[PDB]
Amino acid sequence: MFVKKGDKVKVITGKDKNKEGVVLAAFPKQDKVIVEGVNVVKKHQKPNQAAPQGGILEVEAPIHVSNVMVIDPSNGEATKVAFKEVDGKKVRVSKKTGEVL
RNA sequence: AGCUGUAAGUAAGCUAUGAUCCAGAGAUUUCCGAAUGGGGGAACCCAAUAUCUUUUAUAGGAUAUUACUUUUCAGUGAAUACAUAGCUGAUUAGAGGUAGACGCAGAGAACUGAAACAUCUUAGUACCUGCAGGAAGAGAAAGAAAAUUCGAUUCCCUGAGUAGCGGCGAGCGAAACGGGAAGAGCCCAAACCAACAAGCUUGCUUGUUGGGGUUGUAGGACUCCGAUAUGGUAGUCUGUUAGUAUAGUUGAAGGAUUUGGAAAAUUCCGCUAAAGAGGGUGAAAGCCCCGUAGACGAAAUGCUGACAACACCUAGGAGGAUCCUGAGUACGGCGGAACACGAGAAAUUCCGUCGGAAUCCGCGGGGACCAUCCCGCAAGGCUAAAUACUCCCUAGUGACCGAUAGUGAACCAGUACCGUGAGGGAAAGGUGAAAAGCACCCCGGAAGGGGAGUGAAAUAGAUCCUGAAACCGUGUGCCUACAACAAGUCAAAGCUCGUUAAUGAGUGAUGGCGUGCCUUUUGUAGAAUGAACCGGCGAGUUACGAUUGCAUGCGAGGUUAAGUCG
RNA sequence: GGUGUAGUGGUAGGAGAGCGUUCUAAGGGCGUUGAAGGUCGAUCGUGAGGACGGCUGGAGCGCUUAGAAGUGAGAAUGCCGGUAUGAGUAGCGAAAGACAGGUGAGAAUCCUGUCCACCGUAUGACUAAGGUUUCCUGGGGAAGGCUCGUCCGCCCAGGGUUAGUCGGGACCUAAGCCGAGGCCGAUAGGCGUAGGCGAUGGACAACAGGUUGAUAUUCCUGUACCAGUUGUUUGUUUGA
RNA sequence: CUUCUAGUGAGAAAACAACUGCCCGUACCGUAAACCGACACAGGUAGUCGAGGAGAGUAUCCUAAGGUGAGCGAGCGAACU
RNA sequence: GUGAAAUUUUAGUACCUGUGAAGAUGCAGGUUACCCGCGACAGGACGGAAAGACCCCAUGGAGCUUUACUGUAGUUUGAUA
């Protein structure tokens, strides 16, 4: 999906613009992604098997995948991603000076 | 790099030793149904014969085989002796469905038009039945014509609403010449000659296989010599490659600022294009995501070319003694039909019935019939393309619809529902960017509500976008219990307000005048006709011809049709 | 442009010139600092009609010039939908109940009792069609029930039907039906022989009692019967 | 079912014991609120059983075994039907 | 307690004598009459329900008759195979 489940990522659009975080889960075929600490939401649960005291709880919500950008692990600036011919495990070979991501 | 459909919810698991997913080839495939071992009220019931299994044994389980017809071969076989009916067995093919389409045949209406109706029209249309094919049908002159000819069939333009047909009425309605798309030709019978069998006429009569031979400028046989080579195919599940359909790969270029919950919007300053087609993203993006222009790719299976093999087919010149060239056929009388042609002066082509030729010194046609001239050679077979149609699969397109529209059906629709049955047949789309879908408290059995919270917004709370009218309520400024009112209009005191600012707005005691709307009628308030009310839908259009007015281009001239490239 | 003079009721019907709706092209524009749509106003033009302002609303839409049309609604005893009036009106589908006590948020209507009343060749018991889960147990009360409801043939969750001998098949045939060959006939097909299907009839071996919340000639107890199978108890000529 | 022969055709009669015996239906309503009548509808629905007194009787009235009080009520006690 | 229907242009819906498509709640001139209901009766609303079944028309249908026209199945008689 051009973004994987273990991955550091920066946010382009939507109220968390400029935040970073490690990807938490990938949902292909709906093209969304959960990022750590990024789209916090407040629910209201009644007691059930998990947390028999259901308070007002807060977890992340999935954002759309094109609101996101990969970060080169070694250098730290967000990059568009391209594919090139290494010994034939084709990996995302970063733009912005041809390094492996 | 995630995954176990819709589909939430939980429980158990799988995957970097490559899941899930995608394309080619395989394997498995209960029962009904042509249904085919026998039966039957479809999805059930009951067997026979062999091999194998459970049991000490019977009962029980499994696997194969077993319809009918045809067409080939053996065995058995008889009223009736020889053998043919028959019977048993082995072999060969059919059988049913559909694409509510397109084709060729058999049989074959009516309402309707003729301002009635019989001939005629509707119309050889609708319906029913047979046979197909990927196309069918037609197709290689017993032809079209009229001097000077041309050469198989089909389709389009034109000829032309002409020549004709017709209770000569309503109406029906050609063809050839001329211009184009596509183009292609072939095989038998007969005479004769051999091999075999029967009649052994031991005459050569019957036949079976092979050869020869295919036409009108007449051709062949037959006798004479030449040659014994050369031109082609509408052929094969044979090889060699080339492409192609069915998965995929890669693919340029942006940040800050203002307003917002959120920018793709605004303002600055950049970059990219063989890519500014389109879709998505919290609002409107060439530069965020999927793509696009361009470049690349197939283990397997199927298609289409090309070139190779293999299979088939194809010769001249002369002679004119004799033989061959499709018989109950052509044709004629009688009765019907088909030809645009309704018996007509009726040629041509078919069907039923009866009669019935000739043989190259011949036979047919040129719209009754004859003579002369001209063009052909029936009574045997096959054949690509140019033309018709779309159940279905891929890729797209639209001065086509947008939930009473568009399919009957945007949603679990040929469904619910209705009918014994054949058959008839609907209604019903939209929270939000994201479920963040209201934890906790209070009234109440609950339903429902009020706070508090989510959220940019809840009067976006699931009967959830917007939220019109009929219709039902609550509150108020002004009027109303001596008054006969198609309900308004003109005149007007009092009270209450204060506008798109101008000769202001609401209500109104009291006074004059005044019999709705539509349709059809000589004529309507009509006791003539229609409407409960509100909302939606609901009626002179298009194709091809003919005529007139206006307008433009050419002008004694004007203009192209089918078709070809695009 | 001025000025004079003359004219300007109208059904059938002829002629002219315009208003508004949707879509296409080209040009110039607007929009989350809020488009279309909805609602209100005391505004403009000779008419169809055009603006501007408030409130609502949340994503698209005007203007100019030309083009194309499923282009305008008050009426068809029109079609579909929604809602009125008649009106809190007719009716609530033959019949005897009363009281005490239970349950419950709530009782004329549900439960338990007592007395009273109704049918009794049926309004009692069993069965073939037909229906198809309506049967039993535990919960429920939004709709169905002509009132009510704590109740139910309603709704949710679980559960119930046991055969050598009963009724049907592995037995028989009636009417009628089907029919290998056959005979007839534009097609399709019509009839019919051998042989079959087809009960409402023929044939054919088990009874009495007990037991569940729901089955009993089916389960259990006792005592039987029918058809087979295994074991231990003479010449297929035929007198076996 | 019972006889008689024709008939491929070792030798089966009957004692005890113990074994074998398949498929379909089977709940519940059924003179009814469960079937046919659009309805929890004063209609229709084959067959067997169907008691007592008085009576010829399955008539008639009252009852036995069994079943039932019928799915809108409380008042008033006019016209009229 | 529950809860319909046929109907309906809008209605603040009197009487007499006239007028008028010639029999008026609504038009003229008069006469009478405070506002809103309940139980009853049927004179009027040419009352509701059914685009007259009576009568005539459409160069409308359909069923029937016959010495109306034109045909035909069936029966019969001749020629010919």
Side-chain angles (χ1 to χ4, degrees), chain A residues 24-98:
Chain A
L24 274 189
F27 305 102
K29 103 170 88 130
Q30 47 205 112
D31 276 15
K32 300 213 141 176
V33 125
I34 296 184
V35 179
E36 203 170 21
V38 155
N39 201 12
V40 186
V41 118
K42 292 158 194 160
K43 302 176 167 156
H44 297 256
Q45 290 196 320
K46 308 198 123 107
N48 71 306
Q49 194 38 253
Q53 284 175 54
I56 291 171
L57 296 133
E58 340 212 315
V59 276
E60 298 97 357
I63 61 170
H64 201 267
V65 162
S66 55
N67 300 349
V68 110
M69 273 260 233
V70 189
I71 319 183
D72 190 334
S74 45
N75 311 340
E77 302 175 48
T79 56
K80 275 190 187 197
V81 167
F83 296 72
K84 304 202 100 167
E85 274 191 14
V86 190
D87 296 319
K89 270 278 168 72
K90 300 190 155 180
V91 206
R92 316 184 282 117
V93 188
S94 139
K95 292 193 185 184
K96 304 239 187 198
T97 74

